[PDB]
From a paper:
Haloalkane dehalogenases (HLDs; EC 3.8.1.5) form a family of enzymes that catalyze hydrolytic cleavage of carbon-halogen bond in a wide range of halogenated aliphatic hydrocarbons and their derivatives via SN2 nucleophilic substitution followed by the addition of water, and releasing a halide ion, one proton, and the corresponding alcohol as reaction products. The structure of HLDs is composed of a conserved main (or core) domain, consisting of eight-stranded β-sheet and six α-helices, and a versatile cap domain formed mostly by α-helices. ELB17, paradoxically possessing the highest thermostability among all biochemically characterized wild type enzymes from HLD-II subfamily.
The crystal structure of DmxA wt was determined by molecular replacement and refined using diffraction data to 1.45 Å. DmxA wt was crystallized in a primitive orthorhombic crystal form, encompassing two protein molecules in the asymmetric unit. The two molecules in the asymmetric unit represent the dimeric form of the enzyme, which was also observed in solution. The second halide-stabilizing residue, which is asparagine in HLD-II subfamily, is Q40 in DmxA wt. The water molecule (HOH511) is situated in a canonical halide-binding pocket of the enzyme and interacts with the nitrogen atom of one halide-stabilizing residue W106 Nε1 at a distance of 2.94 Å. The side chain of Q40 faces away from the halide-binding site and makes polar interactions with the side chain hydroxyl of Y68 and the main chain carbonyl of L203. This suggests that Q40 residue cannot be involved in the stabilization of the substrate nor releasing halide anion in DmxA wt active site.
Numbering used by the authors:
A (entry chain A), B (entry chain B): 3 to 296
The structure:
């Protein structure tokens, strides 16, 4: 992957399970770990990070296979992603961690926090994987037919991702309210220029929990939600209108369901809200970490 | 003035300088003082207060001459409003105050807070008077025409306020996105049904600081903004899109200019944002008071 000229944070790499994972880093102190999802990378947070400079050690990591991380010769099943992100976090020896997470990055962050609660200081999340999606008819029409068709066969998934590159070229722009500049979209294309490598883009849409399927992802997500409902850890839910994974009424559900949950509304956004309201998102996290000067 | 049907807080009156000032009240603890501006009254906050019950002693006051307050035979210059609101606050012996303020209520609130900082616990404000308006070119052309014409002569100000009642009849509904129900508009009309009494409505738009005019208001506002820039008191700026006195780019400036400032975006609104997003406004204040240990 060629590093985009508009990503002004330094590239570092950690050795994890015989591969290298990329992350950008800024500052010192307790870590603020930023976790992206499908089909993005740490670039997604480039305009959010400036709002949090000086609030701790910013670490925005690319999941294995994504961004500027290596693409080892592996299936990129959910277990793979779990192992490699755990390996990353261990490789850096992170503790006292504030996770800032989105989409699959929230599945992984929440599952990590569930398994290592002692290592967490706080959880900030947006357009996250919280209560499982109960079925296709309760799922947002924006993507419902897209997911059904992709999930119906490996051939369909491969056509859609490898030949048509639909997640990058179509879904991503469609789930951002403002128009992307060409070099911004090019940044999202840049890890995925090779057709065969785009097989990797199949696995997240094949594994999104819908109607308890896949069953392993349903069990893990159900289990971290049960745990989230008991944890006293400070939580921040950043939300947009109309949103996607977290529409407006679901926001209020979480205020009641999750202890010590604060919220911040950032206005118009669908799924990749960092592209619509980065400054507001960053400032929401900053204000929440500052705790009114207490 | 008769109490509106949808204003469900009990009416009280304080004796201040030989007149009665109306206020509504709820609860106990450290006070939340709600301050309205032009051409409203405490009714403006009727749907905000329910979000804050149990968070302190809620006190929403009508400026002298406004709402259900008496209309004594006085000039109603800015100094008169200062003396009567000081007299109100003293009459109730309010201390450890969280001021929640809007438009001219913010001018009076901030001027009080600047002179008596030891009486203040926090400041929550929206569509407020912070940096003076730099010139008439800060308004869109319709609004600029309104102010210019009103300010050009006493006869124009009297026509517009006394004969046309334009602040109630036009500006008010124009600066709320949703349509007002008939009883809501009637509530705003009700203190101003008398033509002679509407002379009072001239003073605020004649004294709004625009391009350093008038000089008294420029001095006082410049002084309290300097003070706001230094105090660590908790502050909350609630804002809407596109807003009016505080448009989006100003919000961002205040984020950096004023210490310990939290922001809360409430979505669509112009000036009288209480009428568009009262629940969100109230909830934003509630969350910020909890964060701030208020
Ligand atoms: Na490897
Ligand atoms: Na949705
Ligand atoms: Na915010
Ligand atoms: Na009097
Ligand atoms: Na006093
Ligand atoms: Na206007
Ligand atoms: Na701020
Ligand atoms: Na600040």
């Amino acid at each position: 992957t060629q590093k985009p000229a508009d990503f002004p944070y330094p590239s570092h790499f950690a050795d994890v399970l015989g591969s290298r994972m990329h992350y950008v880093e800024h500052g010192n102190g307790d870590p603020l770990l930023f976790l992206h999802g499908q089909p993005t990378w740490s670039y997604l947070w480039r305009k959010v990070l400036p709002e949090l400079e000086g609030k701790g050690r910013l670490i925005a990591v690319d999941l294995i296979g994504y961004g500027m991380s290596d693409k080892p010769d592996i299936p990129y099943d959910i277990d793979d992603h779990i192992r490699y992100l755990d390996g990353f976090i261990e490789a850096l020896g992170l503790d006292r961690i504030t996770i800032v997470c989105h989409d699959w990055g929230s599945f992984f962050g929440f599952h990590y926090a569930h398994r290592h609660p002692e290592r967490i200081k706080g959880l900030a999340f947006m357009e996250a994987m919280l209560n499982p999606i109960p079925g296709y008819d309760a799922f947002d029409p924006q993507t419902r037919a897209f997911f059904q068709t992709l999930r119906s066969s490996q051939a369909n998934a491969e056509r859609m991702m490898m030949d048509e590159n639909q997640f990058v070229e179509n879904i991503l722009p469609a789930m951002i309210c403002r128009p992307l500049e060409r070099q911004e979209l090019d940044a999202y294309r840049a890890p995925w220029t090779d057709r065969q490598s785009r097989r990797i883009l199949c696995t997240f849409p094949q594994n999104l929990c819908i109607g308890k399927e896949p069953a392993s992802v349903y069990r893990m997500q159900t289990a971290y939600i049960e745990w989230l409902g008991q944890t006293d850890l400070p939580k921040l839910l950043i939300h947009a209108e109309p949103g996607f994974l977290i529409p407006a009424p679901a926001v209020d559900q979480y205020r009641q369901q999750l202890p010590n949950l604060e919220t911040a509304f950032v206005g118009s956004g669908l799924h990749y809200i960092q592209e619509d309201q980065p400054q507001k998102i960053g400032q929401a996290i900053a204000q929440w970490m500052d705790r009114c000067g207490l």
